[PDB]
C-alpha cells in the first residue's frame, strides 16, 4: 500500500502544516499536524473541556461504528514550547491520503492548554517519531507510520513540505518526480526515540562551509531552526540590526532587511535555506521589528530541524530496520 495527502500551512507564515486524516466510520475528517517530533496521534474530540474548545473540528467516537474505548488507557503530553494535553484513549480506523490503518490509537483530548485552544485550525497532533516516546498508559500505543509500515510498499514516509504555500506527506514510496539531484542519506539515532541525526555543518549566505558535526532532530511539527548559539550568533551577525532580544525570546532584526541564505550539511551534500524562509514576521502587528527563523537551541537541550530547515529539502524519514534519514534538494 501507499498514502499520499497533501499539506497545508496554517497561516501566511507557515507557523505549522495541517495534513486532512479520515478517522472513524463513516469518515470524519480532521486536519491535523504530522509532528516527526512526537509519537502521539490526538485530537479534539467531543470529550474536550467546552471552554477549551474554539472553532476545531472534533472527533466524536460515539458516532464512530468503528471507535472502541481502549480501557483504562489514558495519555498526558507536555511539548517543548510549555503547551499540553492530555485524555484517553480509543482505537478507530483511521486514513491518511488513501492509506488506511485499522485499529489505531486515537487519543481524545479531555484538556487541552491555552496555545492549543487559540489556535483554530488545527484539529491535533499525528506523531511521527518512534513509538517509544508514545504517552499512553499502562500500554503505550505505535504511532500510525509504525501500524502501516509492515502493508508499505517500502517502510518510509516522506515530508515535502511548502513555503508559503502547500506541500505533499507521502506513506510507502519515494515520488522521484518531487526532488533535483540524489537523495543523500545519513545515519539517525533512535536512542531518544527521535529522529536524530548528525548535520555536517553550515554556511552563512555566500561564505564558507564550516565542516562542524551537529546533532539534531528532524522535527516536522517545530515550525523553526533552532542551532547552537555560536552558528545562530555567526548567522543574525550577517544581518544589519540583528540582535538578540530577552524580552521578545530570541533573534529579531529590521522588516527592512534582506536575509541570507543558510546551508547546513547532510553527509557532503548541502540544503540551502534562502534567507526569505528564515523571516517570521513582525514580532507584532505593525511592528517594524521581525521574528528571526534560526533560533537558538540554548536553553532546549536538542538541536532541532524545524520546518525552516526541513521545507527547503524532500525529506525521506526511512522506518527499516536500521533507521536512516534522506534529504534532496527540489
Ligand atoms: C502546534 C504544535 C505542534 C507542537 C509539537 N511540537 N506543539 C507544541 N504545538
Known amino acids: 500500500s501507499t498514502g499520499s495527502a497533501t499539506t497545508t500551512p496554517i497561516d501566511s507564515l507557515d507557523d505549522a ?5 479520515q478517522i472513524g466510520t ?16 490526538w485530537v479534539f474530540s467531543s470529550e474536550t473541556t467546552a471552554s477549551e474548545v474554539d472553532g476545531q473540528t472534533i472527533y466524536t467516537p460515539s458516532k464512530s461504528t ?44 479531555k484538556k487541552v492548554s491555552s496555545s492549543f485552544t ?9 506523531g511521527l517519531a518512534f513509538s517509544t516516546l508514545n504517552t499512553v498508559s499502562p500500554t503505550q500505543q505505535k ?13 518510509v514516509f516522506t ?40 548535520s555536517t555543518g553550515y554556511a552563512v549566505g555566500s561564505g564558507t562551509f564550516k565542516s562542524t558535526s551537529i546533532d539534531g532532530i528532524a522535527d516536522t511539527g517545530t515550525t523553526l531552526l533552532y542551532l547552537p548559539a555560536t552558528v545562530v550568533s555567526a548567522y543574525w551577525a550577517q544581518v544589519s540590526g ?42 507584532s502587528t505593525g511592528s517594524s521589528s521581525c521574528f528571526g527563523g534560526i533560533q537558538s537551541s540554548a536553553g532546549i537541550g536538542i538541536n532541532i530541524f524545524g520546518d525552516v530547515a526541513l521545507k527547503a529539502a524532500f525529506v525521506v524519514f526511512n522506518g527499516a530496520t536500521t533507521p536512516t534519514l534522506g534529504f534532496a534538494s527540489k
Open 66 to 109: 468503528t471507535a472502541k474505548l481502549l480501557s483504562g488507557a489514558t495519555w498526558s503530553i507536555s511539548y517543548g514550547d510549555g503547551s499540553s494535553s492530555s485524555g484517553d484513549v480509543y482505537t478507530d480506523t483511521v486514513s491518511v491520503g488513501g492509506l488506511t490503518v485499522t485499529g489505531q490509537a486515537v487519543e481524545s483530548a
Open 242 to 283: 540583528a540582535k538578540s532580544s530577552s524580552s521578545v525570546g530570541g533573534y529579531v532584526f529590521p522588516c527592512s532587511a534582506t536575509l541570507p541564505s543558510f546551508t547546513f550539511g547532510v553527509g557532503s551534500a548541502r540544503i540551502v535555506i534562502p534567507g526569505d524562509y528564515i523571516d517570521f514576521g513582525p514580532i
Open 159 to 198: 515530508a515535502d513540505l511548502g513555503y508559503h504555500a502547500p506541500g505533499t506527506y507521502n506513506f510507502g514510496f519515494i515520488d522521484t518526480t518531487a526532488y533535483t539531484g540524489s537523495i543523500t542519506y545519513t545515519a539517525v539515532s533512535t536512542k531518544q526515540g527521535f529522529w536524530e541525526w548528525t
Open 17 to 21: 502544516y495541517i495534513t486532512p486524516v
Open 143 to 155: 504511532t500510525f507510520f509504525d501500524n502501516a509500515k509492515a502493508s508499505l510498499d517500502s517502510p
Open 118 to 126: 487559540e489556535d483554530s485550525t488545527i484539529d491535533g497532533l499525528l
Open 26 to 41: 463513516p469518515a470524519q475528517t480532521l486536519n491535523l499536524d504530522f509532528d516527526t517530533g512526537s509519537s502521539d496521534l
